Structure 1
Amino acid sequence: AAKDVKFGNDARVKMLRGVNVLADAVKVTLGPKGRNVVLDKSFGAPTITKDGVSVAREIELEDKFENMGAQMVKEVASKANDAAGDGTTTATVLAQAIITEGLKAVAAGMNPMDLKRGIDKAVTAAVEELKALSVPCSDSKAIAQVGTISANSDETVGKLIAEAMDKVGKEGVITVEDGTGLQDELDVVEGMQFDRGYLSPYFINKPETGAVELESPFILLADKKISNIREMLPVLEAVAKAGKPLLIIAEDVEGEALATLVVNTMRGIVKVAAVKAPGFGDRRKAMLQDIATLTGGTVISEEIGMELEKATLEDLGQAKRVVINKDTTTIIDGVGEEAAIQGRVAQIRQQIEEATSDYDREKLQERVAKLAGGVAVIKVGAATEVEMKEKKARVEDALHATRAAVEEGVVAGGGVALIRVASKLADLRGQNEDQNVGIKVALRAMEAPLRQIVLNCGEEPSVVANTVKGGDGNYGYNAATEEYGNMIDMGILDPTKVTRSALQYAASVAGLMITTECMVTDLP
């Protein structure tokens, strides 16, 4: 294909125009005051959205070069959401400010490489300062309002989340279930979870979040990389007698064909899934038979001693519910029985004494807590099930935030945290002035999220930013109530996890943007 080659300022000017168009649309929707963006939908009334992610995914530009600049910022903003579940608009507000000023400095003939180093040095220092700024919210009492604040300042969703982590503070998995009673129901089931993606991108089922809630499927568990269609078809034939969905847990399938192919064949037919087992080698294999002991299943392949093909519905695990997604496999409640599952407890307690490897010891002491801790199951018993269905997303909204908050503590929400780092590290100086200019570009960019939010509020951003900069600690503007106060006390706070991720991702995209010598795109 013919490729259009662009160079120097020619390419950079095109890239900035694309960054600006995407940032402008995402920036208006920052904070409680974010103005709605009308997104054309192909049939039906155009969607009106106050959410940055929907607008960003929508934005595509017709200029090949301008689109490439927009796409690069979008992927880093999405990466911020992957690390912590929000920060998508904040990442683009920060990225646009660093990128626009940095590109202008490069257009002044300044060395791009140390401009990049100076911005990165300031970012690393700011990240350490943010951790110092952090308020540990480990205690359940802190979790109680942290969770209420986390759920878009809603007490009802927050308290249920807080009630369960009252159950497990930290690592206990908590899941959201539609309530079967009009009173809310919470129980802890000693099920399981592991952070392993599904073996095709296309396994998505009914919940609009790329995920696979699955009611009473049976589970295959395999100890060699499975020979595919010839011996999986017997099992699929057996599975299709009963009518239940199947999940493959394995090393992989012999996957170049059928791990790609099976989800394109089987969605409309039967619904069948596949996932990687956790860790590698003996740990993966041992962990698969740990998984087996907990589900009630046994592990199966031609290779070791326990042939696959003629397997029945008894020769499987089963779980009352399963969740599976791009990045996670979750077992909500096995068919396995208390005594058999506790065939494990004697060994796992024993090996913790003595294991000759430090990470084997760590894995064993992680595994026993995990195995016994289980999954906290929250049933949202709202009077209206459509409304608990609606609040169900906010509850998933909340635990993403609450989990991030417990992991890194909390910072003064509002860009007050970035203002105090900016004021805190004004002293930091670059070795050369290209480096010095880079430090300043990063510091000025840190002010941009607070200023954009006050602009959406209609307050002129400068008076407020001057007052917030002048103020002490968590003194900040609550734009929803339009007055200054202590933000943490007022109830505006976010995890140090979220702010740190947005700043780091914004810095990386900006550095690449400043140092991009040439852009090659397909000819229009």
Structure 2
Amino acid sequence: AAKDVKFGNDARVKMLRGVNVLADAVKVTLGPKGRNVVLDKSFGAPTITKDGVSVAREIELEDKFENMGAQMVKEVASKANDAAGDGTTTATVLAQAIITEGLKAVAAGMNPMDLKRGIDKAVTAAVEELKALSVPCSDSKAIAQVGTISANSDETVGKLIAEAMDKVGKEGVITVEDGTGLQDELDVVEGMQFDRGYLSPYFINKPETGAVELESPFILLADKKISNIREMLPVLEAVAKAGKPLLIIAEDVEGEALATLVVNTMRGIVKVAAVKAPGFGDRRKAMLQDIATLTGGTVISEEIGMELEKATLEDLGQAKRVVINKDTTTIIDGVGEEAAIQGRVAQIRQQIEEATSDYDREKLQERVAKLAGGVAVIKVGAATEVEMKEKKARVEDALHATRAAVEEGVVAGGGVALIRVASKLADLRGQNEDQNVGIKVALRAMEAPLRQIVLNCGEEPSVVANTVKGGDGNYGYNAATEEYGNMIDMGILDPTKVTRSALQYAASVAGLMITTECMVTDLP
């Protein structure tokens, strides 16, 4: 359709007004004293949230040019949530301050391209200084502190996440889901714990629990679906000769074969049970092979070549304990070679590195956690749905912060890391004066997270910023107690990945946003 075209300072003012609207919506949540934002949802109750990415997503303005500004600065929080999962509010606070101070220099006649180059140089040096300033976070106490701080100073969430990461180890996968109680629940599972139940109700060895218990059982893995008892009949006779129980992981066991095996189960010849194969095509085979590697067996398929009739006891897998129930099935101490297990770990990790999709990569990481380590599920307990959503978002942010902490390390929280970085970058210079001014606005906007934290606390941002800059090292501002001290000792840590990602994405979008002169939108 027809377009409205704005040029120069008018377009810059409209775009900055939109950025200010989005950033003022977002930044009322920063820090421990930050407040919540209600987002009206057309379907369901309104969402009360304290994370900046949801507020950033929900902002869209009537003025088209202000809407441009809002969408471009919303990209900052979207990217910061995609990469690190935390620091979306900090990223928007940084982006708004770079745009505001950058447009001040743009209005001052300085070249916006050179300002963007200066911002990029300053932020590259800032990332280097953050990496130098970072300390690796491996101890559980610092992990608990990171999880607490990232969850609005909720010590219960931080200690629960620390215990979960301790239980599942470094290779474990932890996810957050809703809970039925009012309290947070941690559910840790070990070994292969795929979510497929028994194919028939009559397998139950323990009727008082509805769970089939198999002690040192044989495991047969049939990639193809079976409807006839003929194929594994030699295997059934062999396992009856052995006398040990047998569990089948198959695409589908149904009809005559299923009836024959359940009848033989209650006849007592074989303590046999069959369950569905996990997942769907192109993923069923790989983690079926993972099950075989864990149990020290081999999958039976037409592609691999051997048939179930030729399958023997050596072909079948071996484990120490097996639990079947209605929804899932657990395998405990699968008898497989350790070296093959670690080789499979390395292969799936290489697949993770080659994976360019979040869904495939997270499925591969879940498979790694299944075969090695464990899987933790954190049930968010809250008396109401809106508190459930808010607490779930906070626990998700804390989990992402702990993951970023183990990935890259930790620094002093409350924006003091960026303050120290800017203090270290005092002598950095660009190719010309406009680049130096861009560096200076980047350094000044690095104080924006701390200043906005103090503003949310109700104190004076400038006095506290000067006090923190006067101090050295991890000396900073406890925003919860409104005191001063060593933030590492005070337990206020921020992941280096979160801070660095927030700074980088804010700087990139803000530089590209201050470089603009003309904006072309649809007419109202």
Deviates more, 1:450-459 or 1:232-241: 232-241
The CA distance in 2 between the partners of 1:74 and 1:211, in whole Å, is: 50
Q: Is the 8 A contact 1:221 1:249 kept in 2?
A: yes
Deviates more, 1:170-179 or 1:457-466: 170-179
TM-score by length of 2: 0.66
Q: Is the 8 A contact 2:261 2:272 kept in 1?
A: no
Deviates more, 1:176-185 or 1:193-202: 193-202
The CA distance in 1 between the partners of 2:178 and 2:139, in whole Å, is: 28
Note the C-alpha offset of 1:84.
Answer: 1.1
The CA distance in 1 between the partners of 2:388 and 2:205, in whole Å, is: 20
TM-score by length of 1: 0.66
CA separation of 1:177 and 1:451: change in aligned 2, threshold 3 A: closer
For structure 2, which runs of at least 5 residues remain unmatched after alignment? Answer: none
The CA distance in 2 between the partners of 1:34 and 1:442, in whole Å, is: 24
Q: Is the 8 A contact 1:151 1:157 kept in 2?
A: yes
- Secondary structure class of the residue paired with 2:407: helix
Deviates more, 1:101-110 or 1:440-449: 101-110
Q: Is the 8 A contact 1:226 1:301 kept in 2?
A: no
Note the C-alpha offset of 1:337.
Answer: 15
The CA distance in 2 between the partners of 1:510 and 1:229, in whole Å, is: 67
Q: Is the 8 A contact 1:170 1:403 kept in 2?
A: no
Q: 1:96-125: per-residue Cα shift (whole Å, max 9, x none)?
A: 111122122222332222211111000011
CA separation of 1:117 and 1:347: change in aligned 2, threshold 3 A: closer
CA separation of 1:13 and 1:371: change in aligned 2, threshold 3 A: same
The CA distance in 1 between the partners of 2:200 and 2:283, in whole Å, is: 23
Note the C-alpha offset of 1:226.
Answer: 21
The CA distance in 2 between the partners of 1:269 and 1:43, in whole Å, is: 56
The CA distance in 2 between the partners of 1:430 and 1:204, in whole Å, is: 74
CA separation of 1:356 and 1:486: change in aligned 2, threshold 3 A: closer
CA separation of 1:107 and 1:291: change in aligned 2, threshold 3 A: farther
Note the C-alpha offset of 1:75.
Answer: 1.5
Deviates more, 1:388-397 or 1:146-155: 388-397
The CA distance in 2 between the partners of 1:202 and 1:443, in whole Å, is: 69
Equivalent residue, structure 2, for 1:132: 132
The CA distance in 2 between the partners of 1:333 and 1:69, in whole Å, is: 56
CA separation of 1:186 and 1:40: change in aligned 2, threshold 3 A: closer
Q: 1:375-415: per-residue Cα shift (whole Å, max 9, x none)?
A: 24567899999999986655444322211111111110001
Deviates more, 1:388-397 or 1:424-433: 388-397
- Report how many aligned residue pairs link the two structures: 524
For structure 1, which runs of at least 5 residues remain unmatched after alignment? Answer: none
CA separation of 1:172 and 1:15: change in aligned 2, threshold 3 A: same
The CA distance in 2 between the partners of 1:129 and 1:187, in whole Å, is: 39
Q: 1:55-91: per-residue Cα shift (whole Å, max 9, x none)?
A: 3222211111110111011022111011112211111
Identical residues among aligned pairs (%):
100
Q: Is the 8 A contact 1:293 1:343 kept in 2?
A: no
Q: Is the 8 A contact 2:369 2:375 kept in 1?
A: no
Q: Is the 8 A contact 2:229 2:257 kept in 1?
A: no
Deviates more, 1:30-39 or 1:263-272: 263-272
Q: Is the 8 A contact 2:145 2:492 kept in 1?
A: no
The CA distance in 2 between the partners of 1:109 and 1:148, in whole Å, is: 45
Q: 1:338-360: per-residue Cα shift (whole Å, max 9, x none)?
A: 99999979999999999999999
The CA distance in 1 between the partners of 2:49 and 2:204, in whole Å, is: 24
CA separation of 1:286 and 1:148: change in aligned 2, threshold 3 A: same
Equivalent residue, structure 2, for 1:356: 356
The CA distance in 2 between the partners of 1:131 and 1:74, in whole Å, is: 26
CA separation of 1:455 and 1:289: change in aligned 2, threshold 3 A: same
Note the C-alpha offset of 1:443.
Answer: 0.4
Note the C-alpha offset of 1:292.
Answer: 8.3
Q: Is the 8 A contact 2:12 2:103 kept in 1?
A: yes
Structure showing greater radius of gyration is: 2
Deviates more, 1:142-151 or 1:443-452: 142-151
Note the C-alpha offset of 1:217.
Answer: 24
Deviates more, 1:65-74 or 1:208-217: 208-217
Note the C-alpha offset of 1:453.
Answer: 1.4
The CA distance in 2 between the partners of 1:491 and 1:451, in whole Å, is: 20
The CA distance in 2 between the partners of 1:364 and 1:470, in whole Å, is: 48
The CA distance in 1 between the partners of 2:55 and 2:112, in whole Å, is: 31
Q: Is the 8 A contact 2:182 2:382 kept in 1?
A: yes
CA separation of 1:416 and 1:210: change in aligned 2, threshold 3 A: farther
The CA distance in 2 between the partners of 1:332 and 1:362, in whole Å, is: 23
Note the C-alpha offset of 1:511.
Answer: 1.6
Q: Is the 8 A contact 2:182 2:383 kept in 1?
A: yes
The CA distance in 1 between the partners of 2:40 and 2:289, in whole Å, is: 50
- Secondary structure class of the residue paired with 1:182: coil
Q: Is the 8 A contact 2:48 2:390 kept in 1?
A: no
CA separation of 1:182 and 1:289: change in aligned 2, threshold 3 A: same
